[PDB]
């Protein structure tokens, strides 16, 4: 069974005693200082094609909810960018706060922002999401900050089913959600080798930041809180601040893929 959560006696302070690499040198999320993070020319264009990707269900897994996608052929996949090779969709979630002052897991020169989603894909060369996180190459991940502002249509569909999965092991059929709803106007974006940003935490992602964010509602961010921590039959906990604080960048070079403001050259 797994210790492992977000609060004070289980919370990401406490991670490394069951997985050590919680204080490894390429872990994730990580503050993006963008006049570090520097323009590189040898970026290619990111390619996200999400036309026909095929959702399937979305799961309250007790630290999150997971929208699942069919990851059994090309459809749903990322290209180009930082990424050699073709990685498919396999599910996207989201880390948010207990107030709309935070939630993201990255940061944009110490800015938190409401909430962030990742988009989780795993690259084709090794089979499964299994064999894949097991590899440096394995998993690339999309991140998008939410800025509270004007509903977002894209998300609606999501914040709709909500209430059908309030505690941890619920899940209901999600077919036909269609995540180009959930992509900003412009593709620029920083990268950086990392993490996944829980347990097991292994140092397999290739992440993809988005710089633009995409809208969401002060009432729709309050539907996510409305989940729980807990299953059926517990007491209540809130699902709130399931994020990790951001990690040492160690050695590691986070490339933008497009000239900063802070830039000069
Ligand atoms: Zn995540």
């Given at each position: 069974?797994?210790?492992?959560?977000?609060?004070?006696?289980?919370?990401?302070?406490?991670?490394?005693?069951?997985?050590?690499?919680?204080?490894?040198?390429?872990?994730?999320?990580?503050?993006?200082?963008?006049?570090?993070?520097?323009?590189?020319?040898?970026?290619?264009?990111?390619?996200?094609?999400?036309?026909?990707?095929?959702?399937?269900?979305?799961?309250?897994?007790?630290?999150?909810?997971?929208?699942?996608?069919?990851?059994?052929?090309?459809?749903?996949?990322?290209?180009?960018?930082?990424?050699?090779?073709?990685?498919?969709?396999?599910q996207f979630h989201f880390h948010w706060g207990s107030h709309d002052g935070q939630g993201s897991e990255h940061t944009v020169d110490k800015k938190k922002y409401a909430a962030e989603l990742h988009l989780v894909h795993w690259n084709t060369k090794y089979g499964d999401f299994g064999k894949a996180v097991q590899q440096p190459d394995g998993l690339a991940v999309?991140?998008?900050?939410?800025?509270?502002?004007?509903?977002?249509?894209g998300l609606q569909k999501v914040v709709d089913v909500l209430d059908s999965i309030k505690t941890k092991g619920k899940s209901a059929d999600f077919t036909n959600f269609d995540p180009r709803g959930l992509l900003p106007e412009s593709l620029d974006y920083?990268?950086?080798?990392?993490?996944?940003?829980?347990?097991?935490?292994?140092?397999?992602?290739?992440?993809?930041?988005?710089?633009?964010?995409?809208?969401v509602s002060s009432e729709q961010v309050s539907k996510f809180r409305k989940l729980n921590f807990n299953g059926f039959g517990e007491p209540e906990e809130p699902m709130v601040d399931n994020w990790r604080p951001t990690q040492p960048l160690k050695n590691r070079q986070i490339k933008a893929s497009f000239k900063h403001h802070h830039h000069h050259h």
């Open positions: 069974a797994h210790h492992w959560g977000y609060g004070k006696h289980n919370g990401p302070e406490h991670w490394h005693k069951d997985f050590p690499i919680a204080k490894g040198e390429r872990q994730s999320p990580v503050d993006i200082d963008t006049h570090t993070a520097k323009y590189d020319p040898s970026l290619k264009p990111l390619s996200v094609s999400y036309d026909q990707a095929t959702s399937l269900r979305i799961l309250n897994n007790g630290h999150t909810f997971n929208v699942e996608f069919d990851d059994s052929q090309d459809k749903a996949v990322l290209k180009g960018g930082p990424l050699d090779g073709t990685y498919r969709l396999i999309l991140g998008i900050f939410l800025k509270v502002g004007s509903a977002n249509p920083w990268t950086y080798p990392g993490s996944l940003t829980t347990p097991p935490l292994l140092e397999c992602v290739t992440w993809i930041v988005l710089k633009e964010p995409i809208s």
